[model samples]
Target: PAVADKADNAFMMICTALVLFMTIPGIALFYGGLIRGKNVLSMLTQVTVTFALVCILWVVYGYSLAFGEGNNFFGNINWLMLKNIELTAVMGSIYQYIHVAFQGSFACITVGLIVGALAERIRFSAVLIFVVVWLTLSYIPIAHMVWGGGLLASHGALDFAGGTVVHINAAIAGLVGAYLPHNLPMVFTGTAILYIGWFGFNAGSAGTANEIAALAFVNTVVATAAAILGWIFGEWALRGKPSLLGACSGAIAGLVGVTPACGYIGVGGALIIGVVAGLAGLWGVTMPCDVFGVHGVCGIVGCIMTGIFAASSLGGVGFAEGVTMGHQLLVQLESIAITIVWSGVVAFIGYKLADLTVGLRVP
Candidate 1:
């Protein structure tokens, strides 16, 4: 039998708070300011209200099915309402409650990202419908597959943080929005908050305040800075000015790119991944909502690169025992393909269900 440690509990609690902060006011403000001023309140409400919904749903059945032990694509419902689990049950070095909160925080932010982007143009009822469907069908299955001993994990896919689970999943589902801001300062402030909170998002994944957390922390800083510079340079080469929006967006790009690789790859890898993500994000304008550009593109890049950089020969933590570069690369690709298809189809269904139930387009 294993026991929880006080220090780890303390650390995890702090990290959970940090991650929770990323959504409450962080992403709310960021996306709120990017949308039309007339619809700002709507955006904030969508994010805040949906976040609460996700939190409640997570406790009810979401966590159970997503994290419980089951099969290749889905987990069991053994943890429904956290039933049969002791209050002091240990998950890794911390209490199981902490794990629940941390994972739930991720779910909240993800729904917030998608809801915030779509709030301006979608009906409130429609958004709610979509959230329920998407979270149930897409998020839960994907989370199980990646982090809950499902298909991807069973196949040896490595995601130190949530490239596929959070970024790509939300981005594809969030391909919904329209807006022009009334507050630049609000956007900048929100961006700053997100940047700070992401340390928790990445480092906290280690489940301990140890060397892996330390590595993720440093990589977060380095990758973000490199992405800023890369984005600014790209702007200079393309449109001329390195605007605050570009910088903030660049920071997010780097954060997304480094997330899956932070603990597994070295500082050098972080820098390269950050720059690549930034440049790709800049090119992401070929699409809208910056969703496909930043999160989608960067997430896919990071997932693929994690496969490359996790090789000890390239200064990473090294692949799992008996895994090789080719094998890992294929695994990563398979994981990405699965997520894309899974999330894409579910997204379509969620949106269509909303359209059928409450009318999708704004009236």
Candidate 2:
């Protein structure tokens, strides 16, 4: 194991860096290009600020709440601020502290999705205040429930990377952002980085360079391709020409859709997922900016599909060690609904508080 350890560590580090790229030039550039020129620097600045805030939060309380020991609700604050954390602490073989760092990246991007778009329209200090509040209340709890040994994971929901936590969650906040306006090319660019960075985002969950990681890697490639084609098919049938935007968006939707199911489903299953995701993505584009529609819809779709396809025959864990598809589906549905409602309440509060403190609507 130690022999392979070198390679694994090297890959994870690279993967981690790439994921960060997705945030900086990745998401930030995409957002920058999309907003009006006057607001570009402001949007970029907000992203940088929130990103720094998220990093610090993880080192402090975030690491504890997400991976700490607690009941089915969330991880206990026992490891608050990573206090007394040590070098030798091991979480699934990766350095415990390092794991915290990696998880923090996800939190940053999720927040950036909200903070970046809402920047031009809102007060800066107010947004900072809201980020703290939202991260504390909205993000930490859901993370625990899904990945931190909370209700969703306990019930066997599979979010291999972040179909729910990262993508869908951001999508929800983004939908709220679109209540004002959206830049399409900017959305496209962001989608591209998301696609590129997703390999690590999905495969890193393996936590090792093993069969599961291999499976996830292949699924990522095939699934994206399938979705691209699927979207094109749909486009040609409906719109006459295969739109570049549809293909790009479909690719992202498939990636988001497959994320939850990747580790659980097989290549065959992944292809089917791509087709379904492509169609769903087409429907998504027709709606609002549909960040919510794409991720939320794709997330729920991926989650439910995992329940169906994560079968031993399909190269997955199989039900109950023999469980049935029906059971897993229920848990996935419950989790998605809970996430939406939870974030909605928290976002409303975060935004309202920002309004009261400095200002909500910009001058």
Candidate 3:
């Protein structure tokens, strides 16, 4: 019989809270500060309401379809509304409730990320409708595939946390919606919160208070710091001045890049990934808020790099049996491509559905 560990349960509970923290005030304020002051309240409302909505959905059916064991694309609905799970049941040393909340938090943040593109561009009703469709069709399937032992996991994809599932998935949805900074101080504050909360996001991913969690924690710190410097340097060289916004953006870029590889790669790999992600992020910021630029581009980079850096010779945990660097890289590419195409198509459908139901843009 499986038993829950007090230490792991405690650690997971804290991690779940931190991940939730990343959304409410974290994403809410971050995106809030970037938009025009007049629309700030609207952005906050969107994030908050959608956060609640995702949580409810997660409990109702989202968890079952995403984590309940089924075909390659989806889990069964056996655990709908968490019906079959016993309160005392343990999922890897932590109580099943803790796992539900933790996974639900991921779903919340992923929904929150999409609101960044909706600011000033979409109607409120349309946003909600789009979210429902997108979350159901896009997020659920991807979450199942990547984390619920579905297609991606079966293929040995190395997303330590959620580089593909969360970052890239959300970024592409935002891109499809296709939407800006008014308050720099607020952006910086949100960045600080996200950085602090990210410890839980990355480390808690280990599902235990173990060496892997420690490695993920340290790698997150190293990569984020390095990316900040890299972005600042690039900014100083190109624009003749470094801006606070660039620093915050660089931090997020590094965070996204390290997200997939934090548990598997070494500190040195983390540093290199950070620098590259920072520079690439600066170059990718062609869209409003740079959602696609930073998250999408860096996510792809991180996923691909995980293949190279996870070699034991590179100070990482090394590839699986009989899996060479070349093979891993190919797998990484396949995962990224699948995520991009899947998300892009679903987003398109979501946007179209919302458009048909109600206008996408505000008059």
Candidate 4:
């Protein structure tokens, strides 16, 4: 009974391509530039190969398990190999096939984020094994719980894009691995690409070219710009000079922070979130590549703040009828806690499995 809209279908196709672009060259170059020159190839290789691996796995069973209808923690395998879906079937205003690719791009980037922590530290095979375990056990379930009409969605969690599912999920896994910027210019270029591609990421989550998409698009711009200034100013104060690396990191922080609230919050709320995320990320940069610092920290901040900014009075789209700010905050906190614990446990298991099988680190 579902019918597709040409405008949405076209938008999603382009968005899918942009999301893929983030991994191939965006994340690849970003992480590549951060690694020591001697290990740049290794880092790039890991990203490229894993990007392909996740895509294949997504088609084989990942998409079905994550997006298919099923229980709270897992989806059914009815969509295995994308079976049983009529080519004309629609999801939202777009084709189901477009949904598959769009969602799959998210999976790819999550894995890409994790490798940034593992680069030059872990064995290549070990990284692969870890990704397989983590993706199957950690990523898919969380995706279902959040985006697939499962537990969190049922619980009224308000993740517009992927503050918890993508940023936090991958940040924790990267943290478990416990992992750099070697080329500042290269990092800048990669950051630019990520910023550009993120429009597709944030806006495309609307699943249509609607007003919500417009809100998300503008929020992405506002938050990122604010975060850059926030970070540079912080750097100027703390380090006595602003650096290019700090600015790039700030941009990512703002992006991650606003990710969950983009479609729901007004531009003013976005500005505040971006500034806060920037400062928090500046403080959270204790980890390798600041994956946990920026993504994890900002993700948490964004998720929690979504509860506040989402109030109608605050210029957000308003919460479910009768849902108070206090209640929404509790829900957001619960989602954050669940994601952290779930991803942490699964990442630990993955690392252990990799350690047992292929050895965790290179000698």
Candidate 5:
């Protein structure tokens, strides 16, 4: 403790940067390719703007809302605009300021999921207003509850890298923004970013440089690979050849599914989760944008799998020293329930508000 864990601080900062990259071109570029060519530019622009907006809000209030001490719902507003942050401030051995920046990056990608696809359908200014509204109300509150010392964390829910918080939350919102101009190549590019950046996404959750981070990193690789195969296999069974689109999408499904449980499970468990996630992911894309299929379907999978894998019986955290499966699962259900209803209600309102102001349909 004397020297502070320089390695963790450094690794976290690096991982933070990688996850930030995921928002910009990762999710944005992926959505870009999925939409029609004409809408790529429009969608990409929205992603860029929303990313900037996230940064501004993060520094101003987002950080405090998610990280500062408060009643379970949210954090105190004392650190607004990062006013009190100083070089000397220490957050988990990193400069207190670095921690803020890292958390902000996560918020950025979260907003990216919505803005990327919704851009063409919703009016720009209207969407911007919705972003401000949703971020403050829905995003901040859920983040506090699940990630900060809110109700979910207190209740013992396990979301290492935002299965409930980010993936599922964004999926429902993406559904609202789904009337689209899709482009396949742009989608590929974005998926690539998501895959590559996910190493940081999962490994970085450890917040320190250690074997746990390594385990998460390796788990990510195995699960992603398994999911790709699982998706391709499913596609071949259903369609014909392993479609390129399906392959990419399958990979994402696996990644999403394994995210929360990455640190908890062994490689074998990772593969099992991955294959299941992959198959489920294929189901996700087969329907609509599959954003939900990947995040929503796989998110639910990841959330529940934690119930099994986190058990010490299966080589996981194992009931957190004294808890039982039923208890942990109840917490999981409660968190997931809140996320679904919260996202659905907020999304309905956000989309409707935007539509009322300027109409959500592209043409």
Candidate 6:
């Protein structure tokens, strides 16, 4: 019953590399540019180090716990040390190794996003401690619940990529840990890189170079461009002038908003999501920890909007059979609420634990 496709295998490996790129130079540069010059290298180092840690943890037990198929809250240890899983095993359309790399890449970026915000204020040892605890308790269970036949997946939540898993989950973690962003030029350059790499993140979720991936890829381009314009226009109107930072922030907004809906929605839907996310991002960045303001709010908006735009009547791929628009909305809301509470609680515990042990805020 299992077979492998060569084309799909190659495409997945490339996609996995792209997503990993999002973490290394992409997120590292993006967040690195956002902090004071004095802290830039430290932050980047922390990002690189944590990324290594997450990858190792993923191989050791992280992947097994999240994807091993246990129950609603967590998966089993059947995949412990990735033992029973053959490198040649098929998951969806790609080889299992590709899935491991692709999935692990997501975990890396999620932690990168959160740690970057806290790097300026948090101690290095404390950051490592928190990542280990949070990744184990929060990221693992959330990934399981959303993707590994856990609670949210069973409820028919439609997260094409990782609006809840990556964006909102990390956003909340940053918010709880206590968090912007310094050099505009470097920030913009980093944003451009992120925009490019995000294509793989959105499209690759389809697991094949098929029509769904095409739709997602095309949507990623349109949404990023549209959000940039929407954000600049809004800034020009509200702030009396459009800044480069506003443009970059708008781009991230659109990216975050379109992430969950890219595969399931049409071009028109992408444009609308871009505009809304851009504006919402503008509103969100009025405070500190702009990542939360942008990713958290936009992730929730995108998740909720997916339920609406997913209707076949709206030029989308349509909802599952017997799924009503009203019902889907409820599910989306419930799913977001669950992620918020789960991530918020776990983040609190992780940060508190670090504070108690190694301390959180650096001296």
User: TM-scores across all candidates?
Assistant: 0.97, 0.91, 0.98, 0.98, 0.94, 0.98
lDDT of 6 by residue, 59-154 (tens): 999999999979899987788779999888999988888888888988998998988778888899999999999999999999999988999999
Ten-residue region with minimum lDDT total, candidate 3 = 283-292
lDDT of candidate 4 over 1-363, digit per residue (tens):
778999999999999998998887998888877888999898888888998999999999999999999999999988888999989989988999999999999999999988865777999999889889999999999999999988999999999999999999998888877831668899889899999999999999999999999999999999999999999999999889999989999999999999999999999999999999999989888434577889999999999999999889999999999899999999999999999999999999999998999798797
What TM-score does candidate 3 get on C-alpha atoms?
0.98
lDDT of 6 at 316: 93
Model 1 lDDT tens row, 1-363: 879999889989999899999998999889877888989887888888889899999999999889988888888888889998899899888999999999998888888778877888899988889899999999999999999999899999889889999988888877633321577788899999999989989999999999999999999999999898988899988987888889998999999999889999999989999999889888885442777689989999999999998889888999999999999999999988888888888988888888899898878
Q: Mind giving the per-residue lDDT tens digits that candidate 5 earns over 110-150?
A: 88877875776677887887798778877888889987889
Global CA lDDT of candidate 3, please? 0.90
Candidates in order: C-alpha RMSD to true structure: 1.8, 2.7, 1.4, 1.4, 2.0, 1.4
Query: In model 3, what are the clashing residue pairs, if there are any?
Result: none
Model 4: which ten-residue window has the lowest total lDDT?
Answer: 173-182
How many pairs collide in each candidate, listed in order?
0, 5, 0, 1, 16, 2
Off by over 4 Å in 1: 176-180, 286-288
List where candidate 2 sits over 4 angstroms from the true fold: 1-4, 176-189
Candidate 6's TM-score reads 0.98
Regions more than 4 Å wrong, model 4: none
| Local distance difference test scores for all models | 0.88, 0.77, 0.90, 0.92, 0.82, 0.89
* Ranking of predictions according to lDDT: 4, 3, 6, 1, 5, 2
